[PDB]
């Protein structure tokens with residue numbers, strides 16, 4: 756069960772990194788570079804930054820022990836975006852679309 760579920764999760768991660776979703780996934784590929792982006796309050800507002808390269812590193816290194824731990828990280832990434840940004844900002848629109856992809860496929864988890 757655990758192995759299977761984590762495979763399911765790595766498939767989701769591979770999809771989120773895929774070219775078919777790149778038009779809205781790209782802001783989430785790497786850690787937010789607060790300084791480069793001029794976002795000098797980012798650290799002060801976001802206490803636990805998260806991005807898809809960090810999730811991929813944690814998957815490769817077998818840090819996730821179960822699907823719930825992986826999902827909590829992916830959702831944290833979206834929540835940080837909803838935290839920091841006005842809800843009408845383009846990056847929030849892209850986060851919502853990528854979360855739709857994630858939640859619909861995560862729902863299709865093998866459950867035993």
Ligand SMILES: Cc1nn(C)c(C)c1-c1cccc(-c2ccnc3nc[nH]c23)c1F
Pocket residue numbers: 781782783787788792794835836839840845846
């Ligand atoms: C520059 C730039 N131009 N455009 C239209 C976008 C979407 C960006 C951009 C580039 C890289 C990362 C981010 C980003 C990621 C996660 N959270 C964020 N919060 C504010 N920016 C965030 C980003 F918006």
